[PDB]
Design an enzyme around this catalytic site. Structure first.
Site, short mmCIF file in Angstrom:
data_model
loop_
_atom_site.label_atom_id
_atom_site.label_comp_id
_atom_site.label_asym_id
_atom_site.label_seq_id
_atom_site.Cartn_x
_atom_site.Cartn_y
_atom_site.Cartn_z
N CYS A 181 64.19 -64.55 1.75
CA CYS A 181 64.25 -62.58 1.67
C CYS A 181 64.47 -62.86 3.89
CB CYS A 181 63.38 -61.89 1.75
SG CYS A 181 61.39 -62.48 2.07
N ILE B 122 57.53 -55.29 3.52
CA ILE B 122 56.97 -55.72 2.19
C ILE B 122 58.09 -57.04 1.66
CG2 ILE B 122 55.68 -54.94 0.92
CD1 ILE B 122 55.69 -51.81 1.93
N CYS B 123 57.36 -58.29 1.51
CA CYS B 123 58.00 -58.70 0.34
C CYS B 123 57.08 -58.71 -0.78
CB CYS B 123 57.43 -60.10 1.16
SG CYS B 123 58.59 -61.51 0.68
N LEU B 124 58.10 -58.21 -1.53
CA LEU B 124 56.95 -57.78 -2.75
C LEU B 124 58.01 -58.34 -4.37
CD1 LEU B 124 54.52 -56.54 -4.82
CD2 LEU B 124 55.38 -54.23 -4.09
N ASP C 64 53.77 -65.75 -1.74
CA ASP C 64 55.03 -65.08 -0.75
C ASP C 64 54.70 -65.27 0.66
OD1 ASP C 64 57.52 -64.41 0.00
OD2 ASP C 64 57.56 -62.59 -1.12
#
Lengths: 75, 377, 147
Positions: free
Chosen positions: B348, C84-86, C117
């Site tokens: 990501c 936000i890396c959710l 993460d």
């Protein structure tokens, strides 16, 4: 025996294991079949998460038991 | 072997009496700056008989030999121009997965049929004269060209999250809590318009007995019905040269290979448009990594690209306009982790974490083992 | 489907609010919400208030909303931009999830950061090695910015 594991993608996989087989053995077989590392595999049966160092019989796993498998990857 | 079958099919296709070039030469002069405008002015007025002659292309004020290279450069420029999303004809399927597809908004133009017929003529001319574009469409596009049925699984090649949601609806039961019904809200220039998949569909909630029809209608609307007229014009332009009896001997992958040739990832662009964190351009790990990438096969480079960035497809302008989950994000290399640990990836963020190894051989071994499980191309 | 669902979620939030996290449209645009999250008591962010911007895609609920932080937070999973890396918003998203579940997940994340993460490798390493220093830095940042 034979057990069924359903993944988050809906894929159903049949595993030929035994009740006396350890969780480590099942995770190693899953890694051999699909390449999923044993640490990244999370298995849930009867509301209990399978943990390394135990056996299927310790979790009351029986014939054609349905397990939920989730793999952690990506980012 | 797959390659032998493809070569046999190519030889059979180009051996047909209905796909043989003439002997007269057709000149085609286009200025380098205004390639799109001149190409549209000339091509969109040529005849079918004229387009079947030898294609001789001379850029204005650019006199040189090896006209094959000139024609290839012209086709490259034209393909990067007409298929550019900024021209409001095609669009990426998703921001972080660069897959070209016909843009539904393109209907806003008074006459999109002329432009799409020109695009079809360009594709047919590229295939006819053994010249390659450099675009990468989605598999459903190729399946539509060959007139194959489209199903739910085809949405996987377009958008992963959409396909996962559709599969979740198919598997798990749908209750009344979800406000899902036979209608789609599409936002065209601010204003949102509701389109009914079935007549009076905006007032029919999906039960547990209708979700199959709902999924079928959604898949058809997303893949086909939203781009009927434009794709019909495009396919008419394409078949103006290549008869449909010729395209229907390939599949969705051999047609891609025929249109775009063998797919390769440039390394110089990759090196020029990357950034480093806690690393310098002169560090030993960086130069060893770039040398290993230089002496590597395209399949393994694609595997590494998918392992790092999360996808094996690139934007239409190389690594310069590279997007992440949130916004633009160029390929990043960072020093993170212990020596023994394998290189890691953050998809990501388009980030690759490479521990500070000591020897190039160890770096190569660790990187290959890390990217083994990834399947590219 | 992309508007009835949003109206239903807004009505449900207006009926039984969680009394800690709030959400509402900005002006009159149902595809752009603002949310407020209170700092969990058992976390170094206690006493702080955080603002979030939520963009609902036109494919909702088939595609997850995009949530971005506004107040700077010293966390091993939130970068300086605010992304936000959710997992619930990229991998484990399903149409059954609502916008309140996302807020609850973020509030739970603010309690126990996930070191698997590491959106910020430096802060993640500090958290995994020196817990006390990470907590002190988080409290200092919360006092400086969150208030």
């Amino acid at each position: 025996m034979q057990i069924f594991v359903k993944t988050l993608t809906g894929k159903t996989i049949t595993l030929e294991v035994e009740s006396s087989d350890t969780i480590d053995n099942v995770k190693s077989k899953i890694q051999d079949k699909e390449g999923i590392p044993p640490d990244q595999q999370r298995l849930i049966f009867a509301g209990k998460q399978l943990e390394d160092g135990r056996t299927l019989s310790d979790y009351n796993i029986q014939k054609e038991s349905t397990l939920h498998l989730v793999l952690r990857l990506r980012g | 072997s797959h390659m032998d079958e493809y070569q046999r099919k190519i030889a059979y296709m180009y051996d047909r009496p209905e796909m043989a070039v003439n002997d007269a030469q057709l000149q085609l002069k286009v200025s380098r700056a205004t390639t799109f405008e001149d190409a549209y002015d000339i091509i969109s007025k040529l005849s079918v008989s004229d387009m079947k002659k030898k294609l001789l292309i001379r850029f204005r004020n650019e006199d040189g030999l090896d006209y094959g290279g000139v024609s290839r450069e012209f086709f490259y420029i034209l393909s990067h121009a007409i298929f550019n999303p900024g021209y409001s004809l095609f669009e990426y399927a998703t921001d972080d997965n660069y897959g070209l597809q016909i843009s539904p908004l393109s209907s806003v133009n008074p006459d999109f049929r002329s432009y799409f017929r020109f695009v079809g003529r360009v594709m047919g001319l590229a295939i006819y004269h053994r010249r390659y574009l450099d675009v990468q469409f989605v598999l459903p596009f190729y399946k539509r060209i060959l007139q194959k049925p489209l199903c739910l699984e085809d949405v996987k090649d377009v958008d992963e999250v959409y396909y996962e949601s559709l599969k979740w609806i198919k598997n798990n039961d749908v209750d009344e809590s979800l406000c899902l019904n036979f209608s789609v809200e599409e936002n065209r220039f601010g204003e949102s318009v509701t389109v009914d998949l079935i007549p009076n569909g905006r007032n029919i909630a999906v039960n547990n007995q209708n979700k199959m029809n709902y999924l079928k209608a959604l898949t058809e609307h997303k893949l086909v019905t939203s781009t009927e007229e434009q794709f019909n014009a495009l396919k008419g332009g394409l078949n103006e040269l290549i008869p449909d009896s010729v395209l229907q001997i390939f599949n969705e992958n051999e047609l891609d290979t025929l249109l775009n040739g063998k797919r390769d990832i440039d390394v110089q662009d990759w090196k020029r448009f990357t950034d480093y964190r806690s690393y310098t351009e002169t560090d030993d790990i960086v130069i060893w990594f770039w040398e290993l990438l230089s002496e590597w096969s395209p399949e393994k480079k694609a595997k590494l690209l998918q392992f790092a960035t999360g996808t094996s497809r690139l934007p239409l302008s190389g690594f310069k306009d590279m997007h992440g989950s949130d916004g633009p994000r160029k390929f990043t290399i960072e020093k993170v982790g212990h020596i023994s640990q394998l290189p890691k990836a953050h998809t990501c963020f388009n980030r690759l974490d490479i521990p500070p190894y000591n020897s190039k051989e160890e770096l190569e071994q660790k990187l290959t083992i890390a990217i083994q499980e990834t399947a590219g191309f | 489907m992309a508007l009835k669902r949003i109206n239903r979620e807004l009505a449900d939030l207006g009926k039984d609010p969680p009394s800690s996290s709030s959400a509402g449209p900005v002006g009159d645009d149902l595809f752009h919400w603002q949310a407020t999250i209170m700092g969990p008591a058992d976390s170094p962010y206690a006493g702080g208030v955080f603002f979030l911007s939520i963009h609902f895609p036109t494919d909702y609920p088939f595609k997850p909303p995009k949530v971005n932080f506004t107040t700077r937070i010293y966390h091993p999973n939130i970068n300086s931009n605010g992304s936000i890396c959710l997992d619930i918003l990229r991998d484990q998203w399903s149409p059954a999830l609502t916008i309140s579940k996302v807020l609850l997940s973020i509030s739970s994340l603010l309690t126990d950061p996930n070191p698997d993460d590491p959106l910020v490798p430096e802060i993640a390493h500090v958290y995994k090695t020196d817990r006390s220093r990470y907590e002190l830095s988080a409290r200092e940042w919360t006092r400086k910015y969150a208030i």
